[PDB]
Amino acid sequence: TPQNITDLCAEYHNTQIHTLNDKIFSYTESLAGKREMAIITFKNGATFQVEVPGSQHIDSQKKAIERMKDTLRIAYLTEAKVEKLCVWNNKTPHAIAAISMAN
Amino acid sequence: TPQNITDLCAEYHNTQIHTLNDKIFSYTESLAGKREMAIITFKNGATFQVEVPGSQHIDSQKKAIERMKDTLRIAYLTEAKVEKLCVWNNKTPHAIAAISMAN
Amino acid sequence: TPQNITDLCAEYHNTQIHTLNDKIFSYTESLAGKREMAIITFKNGATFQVEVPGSQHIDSQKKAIERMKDTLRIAYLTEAKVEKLCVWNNKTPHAIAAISMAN
Amino acid sequence: TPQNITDLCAEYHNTQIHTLNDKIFSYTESLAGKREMAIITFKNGATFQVEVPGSQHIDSQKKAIERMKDTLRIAYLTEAKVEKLCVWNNKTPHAIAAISMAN
Amino acid sequence: TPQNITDLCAEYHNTQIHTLNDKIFSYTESLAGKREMAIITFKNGATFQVEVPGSQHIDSQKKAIERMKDTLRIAYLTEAKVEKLCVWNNKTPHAIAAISMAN
Numbered sequence: 001t002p003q004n005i006t007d008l009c010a011e012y013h014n015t016q017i018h019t020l021n022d023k024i025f026s027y028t029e030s031l032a033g034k035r036e037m038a039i040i041t042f043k044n045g046a047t048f049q050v051e052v053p054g055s056q057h058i059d060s061q062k063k064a065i066e067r068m069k070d071t072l073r074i075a076y077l078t079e080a081k082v083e084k085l086c087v088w089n090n091k092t093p094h095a096i097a098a099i100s101m102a103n
Numbered sequence: 104t105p106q107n108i109t110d111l112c113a114e115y116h117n118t119q120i121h122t123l124n125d126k127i128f129s130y131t132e133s134l135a136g137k138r139e140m141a142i143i144t145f146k147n148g149a150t151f152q153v154e155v156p157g158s159q160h161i162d163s164q165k166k167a168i169e170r171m172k173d174t175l176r177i178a179y180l181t182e183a184k185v186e187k188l189c190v191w192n193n194k195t196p197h198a199i200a201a202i203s204m205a206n
Numbered sequence: 207t208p209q210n211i212t213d214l215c216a217e218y219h220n221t222q223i224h225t226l227n228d229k230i231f232s233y234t235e236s237l238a239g240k241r242e243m244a245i246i247t248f249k250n251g252a253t254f255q256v257e258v259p260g261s262q263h264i265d266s267q268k269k270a271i272e273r274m275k276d277t278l279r280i281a282y283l284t285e286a287k288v289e290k291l292c293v294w295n296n297k298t299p300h301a302i303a304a305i306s307m308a309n
Numbered sequence: 310t311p312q313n314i315t316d317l318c319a320e321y322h323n324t325q326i327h328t329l330n331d332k333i334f335s336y337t338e339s340l341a342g343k344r345e346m347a348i349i350t351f352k353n354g355a356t357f358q359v360e361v362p363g364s365q366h367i368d369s370q371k372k373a374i375e376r377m378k379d380t381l382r383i384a385y386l387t388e389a390k391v392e393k394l395c396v397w398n399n400k401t402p403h404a405i406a407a408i409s410m411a412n
Numbered sequence: 413t414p415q416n417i418t419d420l421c422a423e424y425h426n427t428q429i430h431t432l433n434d435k436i437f438s439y440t441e442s443l444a445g446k447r448e449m450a451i452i453t454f455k456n457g458a459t460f461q462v463e464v465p466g467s468q469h470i471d472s473q474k475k476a477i478e479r480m481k482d483t484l485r486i487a488y489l490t491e492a493k494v495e496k497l498c499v500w501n502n503k504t505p506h507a508i509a510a511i512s513m514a515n
């Protein structure tokens with residue numbers, strides 16, 4: 001069992017860590033058909049999404065997806081600092097796998 | 104996969120972006136039958152709605168619809184400035200498809 | 207589609223708007239069997255309830271009932287000003303159908 | 310239908326109102342098997358629980374129990390003043406049936 | 413029925429109370445498959461996790477597992493002081509069984 005985001009990220013193919021250590025610059029969410037997703041960006045231009053739930057996701061993940069979005073929304077609204085993000089490299093924008101926050 | 108609300112909005116017919124850059128002025132929610140919805144207005148400005156889950160909606164959208172109303176509620180409470188709204192303009196008041204927030 | 211709580215309220219029988227323009231004075235919720243409800247009051251003594259889900263309700267109203275209780279709790283805890291309440295006046299306390307909040 | 314926690318509490322057997330008029334001193338939560346409950350205490354030493362969801366709860370009560378825990382947690386965090394608690398006295402600690410917050 | 417986290421913890425094998433009396437230093441959440449979990453740290457380097465729901469858990473725990481993660485997130489954001497953590501000490505990182513907050 002990983003003890004941190006970096007180690008966890010490393011257990012998957014085409015994932016990479018992005019160290020941001022900054023609050024989220026912008027938060028966007030959509031209910032539009034086939035575009036029920038969330039996108040976040042940081043003042044430096046970095047952009048990430050929380051993918052539309054799909055077949056690429058297993059059942060156990062669906063609830064975690066909803067949670068990530070609750071997390072991103074609140075982190076944004078509170079300006080919580082985002083330390084790191086684990087993301088899949090094979091999606092544009094890069095899809096969020098995990099997030100770490102620290103003061 | 105779009106990287107911002109504008110591009111996302113451009114992916115649908117009958118849509119448009121409303122640039123607000125202002126916090127929500129009022130929030131109204133109804134549990135009344137066939138009128139389960141949320142309605143927001145902007146100071147001296149427009150009124151927007153999150154449509155009642157109708158036949159027009161695909162199953163994937165339901166949760167996103169619930170999420171959008173929660174988002175509108177908290178942005179209102181917290182007085183978070185809304186950047187832009189992507190709405191369907193073949194509906195009245197215009198119906199919210201997506202929302203971006205940035206300071 | 208109604209653009210405000212007043213117009214929405216008038217779309218049903220046995221309803222009426224109560225203008226409060228004030229914060230919720232007290233918030234009460236119960237988990238007791240057959241009394242899973244919330245009751246709020248205002249400084250002026252006005253008392254309102256969020257009815258226990260029942261046969262008078264249609265399925266699409268179930269989630270809305272839960273959302274309204276979430277709304278009242280946070281509104282209460284943040285002392286959000288409640289503008290108006292559309293209620294059904296054929297129940298005691300008057301049963302909330304909708305709520306509007308404005309600064 | 311009752312109009313306050315006191316009247317609501319009286320509709321059931323083995324219950325009693327505790328008048329606290331104080332913020333919560335401690336909040337405890339457990340995910341341990343057969344002990345998925347929550348415990349709160351007030352500076353005067355009073356201790357109350359939200360029972361593990363069980364056979365003694367009708368279905369309609371299930372969501373309400375979860376709601377009650379959310380309430381206590383946010384009430385704790387906001388130092389919200391708890392006016393009264395309606396509890397079942399045939400349990401130790403006494404089990405929360407309802408809660409009223411004011412002043 | 414236990415009246416505090418310590419007595420509760422003592423009801424199980426392989427558990428222990430960690431007394432922190434401190435805010436959570438970092439919060440990490442993952443939606444990655446088979447790694448849908450949360451991990452927190454304290455400035456003293458202490459690491460804990462909320463386990464991925466697994467075979468070791470009974471159904472009654474799934475709900476408490478989600479709420480626990482909800483709890484860890486709001487506490488971190490509010491910088492609320494965590495009093496104690498009841499954990500199973502036969503896992504690395506130590507798995508959270510319960511949490512208490514006071515002061």
Ligand SMILES: O=[N+]([O-])c1cccc(O[C@H]2O[C@H](CO)[C@H](O)[C@H](O)[C@H]2O)c1
Nearest residue numbers: 032033034154159160161191193194198
């Ligand atoms: O979202 N889509 O994929 C999609 C595809 C095709 C049409 C379409 O518009 C229709 O449905 C939306 C909600 O989806 C709104 O209610 C519109 O006002 C309605 O006319 C939407």
Ligand SMILES: O=[N+]([O-])c1cccc(O[C@H]2O[C@H](CO)[C@H](O)[C@H](O)[C@H]2O)c1
Nearest residue numbers: 135136137257262263264294296297301
């Ligand atoms: O919401 N509707 O579509 C609708 C249609 C017809 C009647 C109606 O009122 C009835 O149900 C509501 C709860 O819905 C309240 O319990 C009222 O006190 C009850 O009289 C509501």
Ligand SMILES: O=[N+]([O-])c1cccc(O[C@H]2O[C@H](CO)[C@H](O)[C@H](O)[C@H]2O)c1
Nearest residue numbers: 238239240360365366367397399400404
């Ligand atoms: O809620 N009710 O409708 C209801 C009806 C009859 C008895 C009753 O009490 C029983 O169940 C509650 C939870 O409901 C607590 O566990 C009590 O300690 C137990 O005695 C509750």
Ligand SMILES: O=[N+]([O-])c1cccc(O[C@H]2O[C@H](CO)[C@H](O)[C@H](O)[C@H]2O)c1
Nearest residue numbers: 341342343463468469470500502503507
């Ligand atoms: O919670 N219980 O009732 C219970 C009963 C018996 C054993 C037990 O511990 C086992 O499961 C938990 C999750 O429950 C943790 O994963 C422990 O590390 C694992 O060994 C837990």
Ligand SMILES: O=[N+]([O-])c1cccc(O[C@H]2O[C@H](CO)[C@H](O)[C@H](O)[C@H]2O)c1
Nearest residue numbers: 051056057058088090091095444445446
């Ligand atoms: O999460 N996993 O356990 C897991 C296992 C194997 C592949 C895998 O990646 C695939 O699915 C994820 C969503 O999970 C993303 O959509 C990736 O971009 C896609 O390639 C993910």
